[PDB]
Design an enzyme around this catalytic site. Structure first.
Site, PDB file in Angstrom:
ATOM      1  N   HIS A   1       0.862  -1.171   0.000  1.00 18.69           N
ATOM      2  CA  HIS A   1       0.000   0.000   0.000  1.00 18.69           C
ATOM      3  C   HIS A   1       0.894   1.215   0.000  1.00 18.69           C
ATOM      4  O   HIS A   1       1.569   1.481   0.976  1.00 18.69           O
ATOM      5  CB  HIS A   1      -0.907  -0.001   1.198  1.00 18.69           C
ATOM      6  CG  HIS A   1      -1.796  -1.188   1.246  1.00 18.69           C
ATOM      7  ND1 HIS A   1      -2.060  -1.874   2.414  1.00 18.69           N
ATOM      8  CD2 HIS A   1      -2.460  -1.835   0.256  1.00 18.69           C
ATOM      9  CE1 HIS A   1      -2.878  -2.876   2.136  1.00 18.69           C
ATOM     10  NE2 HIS A   1      -3.129  -2.883   0.835  1.00 18.69           N
TER      11      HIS A   1
ATOM     12  N   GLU B   1       1.788   3.853   2.818  1.00 17.06           N
ATOM     13  CA  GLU B   1       2.350   3.392   4.089  1.00 17.06           C
ATOM     14  C   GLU B   1       3.882   3.499   3.996  1.00 17.06           C
ATOM     15  O   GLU B   1       4.597   2.501   4.017  1.00 17.06           O
ATOM     16  CB  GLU B   1       1.832   1.963   4.400  1.00 17.06           C
ATOM     17  CG  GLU B   1       0.250   1.905   4.419  1.00 17.06           C
ATOM     18  CD  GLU B   1      -0.439   0.507   4.508  1.00 17.06           C
ATOM     19  OE1 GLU B   1       0.247  -0.540   4.476  1.00 17.06           O
ATOM     20  OE2 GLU B   1      -1.706   0.475   4.601  1.00 17.06           O
TER      21      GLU B   1
ATOM     22  N   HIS C   1       3.557  -3.148   6.796  1.00 17.60           N
ATOM     23  CA  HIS C   1       2.415  -2.290   6.528  1.00 17.60           C
ATOM     24  C   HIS C   1       2.277  -1.157   7.533  1.00 17.60           C
ATOM     25  O   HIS C   1       2.924  -1.137   8.567  1.00 17.60           O
ATOM     26  CB  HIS C   1       1.118  -3.127   6.666  1.00 17.60           C
ATOM     27  CG  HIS C   1       0.748  -3.919   5.452  1.00 17.60           C
ATOM     28  ND1 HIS C   1       0.039  -3.382   4.397  1.00 17.60           N
ATOM     29  CD2 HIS C   1       0.961  -5.216   5.142  1.00 17.60           C
ATOM     30  CE1 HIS C   1      -0.138  -4.314   3.479  1.00 17.60           C
ATOM     31  NE2 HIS C   1       0.413  -5.435   3.907  1.00 17.60           N
TER      32      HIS C   1
ATOM     33  N   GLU D   1       2.492  -4.229  11.390  1.00 15.02           N
ATOM     34  CA  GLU D   1       1.715  -3.054  11.161  1.00 15.02           C
ATOM     35  C   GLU D   1       2.196  -1.927  12.093  1.00 15.02           C
ATOM     36  O   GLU D   1       2.342  -2.136  13.303  1.00 15.02           O
ATOM     37  CB  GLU D   1       0.262  -3.462  11.422  1.00 15.02           C
ATOM     38  CG  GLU D   1      -0.752  -2.710  10.622  1.00 15.02           C
ATOM     39  CD  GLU D   1      -1.286  -3.435   9.422  1.00 15.02           C
ATOM     40  OE1 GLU D   1      -1.208  -4.666   9.390  1.00 15.02           O
ATOM     41  OE2 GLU D   1      -1.840  -2.762   8.518  1.00 15.02           O
TER      42      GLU D   1
HETATM   43 CL    CL Z   1      -4.692  -5.503   3.402  1.00 18.20          CL
END
Ligand code: CL
Ligand code: CL
Ligand code: CL
Ligand code: CL
Ligand code: CL
Ligand code: CL
Ligand code: CL
Ligand code: CL
Ligand code: CL
Ligand code: CL
Ligand code: CL
Ligand code: CL
Ligand code: CL
Ligand code: CL
Ligand code: CL
Ligand code: CL
Lengths: 387, 387, 387, 387
Positions: D175, D178, D272, D348
């Site tokens: 993504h 990020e 992420h 994350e």
């Molecule tokens: Cl995802």
């Protein structure tokens, strides 16, 4: 301070390190610190100081030097500000006054340990690191001409390219307290070897077609570490030793003068600091018999080239002609001038500031000296082209 | 490569990044790479290239540009060497030949990814980081005069001190491929704000008593990122737009020319690169009617000051007088000269090398351009004092 | 060398600088240089050396230390390589052999001036610059506990945040030649104050919730500058002075031990170097009566945490239990352990290399010591959480 | 501003640069700036912003994003502060509020040009410079696996030593918004190649005895430069493409998944950022059938190793098990876990801050992400030793 043990005020002044010098008369209350300039190790000359003060974070310190008017240059205390540093890396000027008898520093340290000094120092470690890097450049060699009284090397930096060329000699810091002289050399050498912002500059490279440089960044290593102003470890004023240097008393000048004699010389510069005048200025040999008309012409031409190379440099203020008519040829530039008949100058930078271009935060300092050194290469390129 | 998957040779040429430009005809065997200069996005002009080659570690790459003789300046390929970099930070020249039809780079990359370019680039990130730091200096402001065709800012850097002074304008990179022009400005600005080795230098400070600087480091932001040589995103040659700039076609010159008109101007410099000549040189307006005798005097005087500021600069080689007698006042320096009657010059640096002072490793590059920029402040101080 | 004067070979060994130590028996021919380890200034202990050799660019130098087998730790010469540096900044290992009588360095300097040393030094200037920067961090204070025999400060670095917490004491370099100990502290402190690559790391910050650090980076400033291995300026072995420290003979331990007594202590570390073993290892007080079972449990737990923090650390090799059963509580860690009943350890790093993870170019050095120091904070966080 | 021309207020918002994204509704008065998050180039997802504001030095700017509650993660605006930078190098948090409808930044720029962004960006130039340096290290290779939709390279960094070892895969920034993911990789790689404060650390070296690393620092180069949050240039969510990657729609995952299949895999990490939770956390495949008991054991063991490697990491907060039970194996870590049966985790990091260890000045940022990356190597060394 959060621990009962650290609580209270415990001031300590120490000075056992490279160039350290102070006598502590009293150091109990921060507003009553009493000091004396310690003076040179084997000579009545006294002016240089350098010491660490700890334990005074946030306390207003009033530090009085009792013998200020007994020092070598009491005029040097007028409009003068001491320099300070929390880390020996960054130096700034602090509030200072002089009443004709005593010097007083009035300053509130922001941290637990601060150093105060007469001028931004230049250490043996810095010197050894600098020359140890410079020697690796393809255009540089370092040669050890001999040893000082206390066994420190007398190091010559030779910069040039393969082949004759004009031999340019630049010596610095005969008076060990004039640390600006070694800052000046650092700036000049950095530019000659193309470091930093001198990386793409072609002046050095052009110069090497015309000249080879013979540079002594520190003429008085022993005096430096001892925290002297004007003399070596034996008490000798190196700049009165050029007529009869001695193996035991002034080996520093013995070995360097032997090298200049054995190599030859076509331009000579002796880099110094002046305690009293807040100006950058040069002194030549015009006020001496044996000074030819073509010498007046070259010297005049070079002074103009230097004004054009740096605004800091000027020719309005300086010393009167018979300042050292008595000591004659005992002084390096006077001697070299006479032996070789070349352009030979003493360059002098201030311990105070450049009154023309002052700076409240730093006065005159290492960075400004280094810039003047780099700028002077421009004047030498002009000169060498013109003659 | 130790993993069966990576084994074999897989060459890839890519160019989707700031200033990237190449057309790949063929890229299978390393000794048979076929390319074309892509050319400007909306103009027949073609010369700039910049691309990444991966997968060729240790392979001899022979890269042929088929349309080299169809480019804007085919003479630019004679005695020219391409530049390369493994990291976009350090650039060096590589072996290159030209037979009158095609350019060939013959080089063996030492690592997995290498970039090749016509000259050391200067990116939008570098620009934005530089101006973003410079603006924080007390003597600097950054003003956004307007937007380019594609919405990038036209940024003016104003350097001076509080109060009238001479207004000095210096604009760079009207032709987006001449990245040396922005390197030159970087060096000039660093010295004006006192960074690095310019920290203790008093030239900037003296200059601020006489002048304020109005500087545009990048006249053609869109053309730069597009990897054009000579035109903006709309196909306009900015240096033919000074008589009738247009909001849609050449806003870059519209907004800058409006600013020069609204502020005034007493010295003007347009910084450029020349593809063909391996020399640093200046062009003025002497070959134009309306050129006064006091203008000849000042221009001549300034050329001498610049020779004295930098050995790279010279006045022997350059272009003949009627090189652009046809385009007249469409060119920035010609126009400004005429509108304001001041010293107005185009300064031109080589894509090849300075044939007088060559360097096999780098040719002419960013560092040398930056040094020339810093050196020119010396010439401006002389000039401003003399007039 | 291009000038008849510099031509020929003129070797000079000098050692008048911070930590310098050598006796020169003979230095005429480069393949016949004869030396002796000078030994400590007021003690029969001898091992440390550090000197500058100039004039040997490109000459093969065979340097023999005649009294190698008469030194404090002759086993230290087996599988040992001397360290060298052209600039005092970058140090590398050089070819070295030992025949059971004499140590021989066989090396060809690449430049005009090189230094040789027993281990990467750590100077008074570095110390003063480091603490002078560290003190400016919001979580750090520097306190001067007292003066060494020769008037150098005994400096304590206190790191923590506002409020009770565990008091962690870490002292280094009681034996002045073990410069690795101060490198180790430098790395540990940099991480505690968040410099460089420790900038976004949260370990220090977590630690400050549990502990405050009381750190002495250099227990023996006089011995360091004197170029001693094991003793202070008065001839005292500081690590035999913990039972009866003396104001005249061992003030360094007097003032530090008074501080530990006045503040308290919950974890103690004494950082050292070992001449003989090529391993990183710890020694505790398990081989002493009065060593509780919960002490065995904590010490064991901490050794496991340290193995997990750094691969360099190990527990297989080390010294036998009764290595100093005779000297008992004269040793710092043994004494502190007994007075406070806390975890108390000596940490020992090699002068040779980590035989488990060797490095031909550098052996064990400053950078590796600094990394081990930073890594140990991880082990302290584990420990403090677990108890 | 001293020149009538610059006087007045002229605000300009621009965003044509790497990762730029904003829609300007209105920008006349500084206290009434109206904006919209622009959203991804071919997808309804919208959250990322990045723009330059000039002309507002000293003006209070109230900047309102009208569609804040229409964005991908409106909870991401609660307790969130925007980041700003005067130079794109140093980023700090600014005052920000959210009323459930609109986000408002209330800030007074101190200089003429400032940038605002959703998080500290990480540019294509930084990436190309970093990998261009890393490739020169002896333990590193860079391999171009393929091209993104818009012709940017998909670059794999392979780190290891000569020979089998465990194959550890770490991919980042599927993504594109990020950017913390690529900061994290930068820190991890710096430590693996021994740069800076990792220079003397032996963890990397130990790791290379057990493992080889296959690292993709930027999975979505096109999405990054486009200023997207969640999708590539074609509108694809790369982390829903692991079951049926496509040459035209999701080549980024096509080529990477082909490489993992062709090389093998023994530990997998997908890095992420999470918009909503102010915590650092991991998600595995435990909530899926086919998850063995030895997998629970390893995953549990690794979570404990990571808590021990970094205080920032925690396992209390995170998402509920059926967060993506619907999308099943379309997610990278779920897919890899199932194909290879190894430890496979999503890591994350927060766009807000670590609520456990907050920092008012920076929140979560590049430096903290880079430290977490470096710290995780410690956890991998533990794991690899234990299994
Ligand atoms: Cl995802
Ligand atoms: Cl003293
Ligand atoms: Cl004198
Ligand atoms: Cl002669
Ligand atoms: Cl004057
Ligand atoms: Cl292209
Ligand atoms: Cl033109
Ligand atoms: Cl006008
Ligand atoms: Cl010329
Ligand atoms: Cl000695
Ligand atoms: Cl001991
Ligand atoms: Cl107690
Ligand atoms: Cl072990
Ligand atoms: Cl946009
Ligand atoms: Cl498999
Ligand atoms: Cl937790």
């Amino acid at each position: 301070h959060e621990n009962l043990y650290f609580q209270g005020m415990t001031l300590s002044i120490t000075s056992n390190f490279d160039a350290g010098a102070i006598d502590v008369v009293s150091c109990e209350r921060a507003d009553a610190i009493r000091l004396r300039v310690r003076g040179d190790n084997r000579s009545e000359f006294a002016q240089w100081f350098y010491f660490r003060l700890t334990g005074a974070r946030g306390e207003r310190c009033v530090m009085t030097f009792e013998n200020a008017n007994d020092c070598a240059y009491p005029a040097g205390w007028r409009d003068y500000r001491a320099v300070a540093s929390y880390d020996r890396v960054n130096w700034f000027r602090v509030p200072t006054s002089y009443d004709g008898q005593m010097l007083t520093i009035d300053h509130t340290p922001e941290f637990d340990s601060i150093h105060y000094a007469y001028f931004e120092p230049y250490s043996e470690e810095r010197h050894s690191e600098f020359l140890g890097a410079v020697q690796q450049m393809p255009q540089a060699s370092v040669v050890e001409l001999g040893r000082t009284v206390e066994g420190r090397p007398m190091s010559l930096v030779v910069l040039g390219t393969p082949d004759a060329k004009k031999k340019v000699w630049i010596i610095a810091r005969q008076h060990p307290g004039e640390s600006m002289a070694e800052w000046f050399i650092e700036g000049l050498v950095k530019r000659l070897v193309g470091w930093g912002d001198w990386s793409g500059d072609p002046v050095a490279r052009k110069l090497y077609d015309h000249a080879t440089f013979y540079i002594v960044p520190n003429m008085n290593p022993d005096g430096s570490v001892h925290g002297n102003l004007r003399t070596n470890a034996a008490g000798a004023n190196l700049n009165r030793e050029w007529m009869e240097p001695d193996a035991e008393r002034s080996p520093e000048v013995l070995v360097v003068r032997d090298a200049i004699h054995a190599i030859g010389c076509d331009l000579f510069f002796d880099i110094h600091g002046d305690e009293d005048l807040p100006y950058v200025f040069a002194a030549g040999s015009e006020m001496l018999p044996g000074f030819t008309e073509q010498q007046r012409v070259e010297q005049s031409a070079f002074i103009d080239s230097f004004k054009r190379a740096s605004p800091d440099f000027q020719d309005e203020h300086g010393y009167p002609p018979g300042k050292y008519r008595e000591d004659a040829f005992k002084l390096a530039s006077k001697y070299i001038g006479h032996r070789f008949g070349c352009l030979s100058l003493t360059l002098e930078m201030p311990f105070k500031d450049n009154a023309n271009l002052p700076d409240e935060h730093i006065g005159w300092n290492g960075a400004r000296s280094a810039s003047l050194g780099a700028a002077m290469l421009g004047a030498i390129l002009e000169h060498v082209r013109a003659f």
